[PDB]
């Protein structure tokens, strides 16, 4: 996984919320797929990939058994910048047997 090294602030701070924020989502005794989604109503300097890959690759660190899908996604975690913000929206969608 990232080598691991400070640096953009903006990220590193995200890092640890979306970590202690999503750990009941995805680190045990949570668990399960989820589907990581970038969205910018404005034009922003930190890439895309970086926050969605990122925020990805600690997903897994929390439970093993965690991993990111993109068809049969449990969660889904939304990025959405505001004020220059790091807005993370959690989803809990289930077709299975309504």
């Not at 999503?22 to 922003?44: D, H, M």
């Not at 990122?54 to 929390?62: K, Q």
Request: glycine share 8%.
């Amino acid at each position: 996984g990232s080598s691991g090294s400070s640096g953009k602030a903006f990220l590193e701070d995200m890092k640890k919320y979306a970590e202690t924020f999503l750990e009941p989502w995805f680190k045990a005794p949570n668990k399960g797929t989820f589907q990581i989604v970038y969205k910018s109503r404005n034009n922003s300097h930190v890439n895309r990939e970086e926050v969605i890959r990122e925020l990805a690759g600690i997903v897994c660190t929390l439970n093993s058994e965690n991993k990111v899908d993109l068809t049969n996604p449990q969660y889904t975690v939304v990025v959405e910048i505001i004020k220059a913000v790091c807005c993370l929206s959690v989803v809990k969608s289930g077709p299975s047997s309504g």
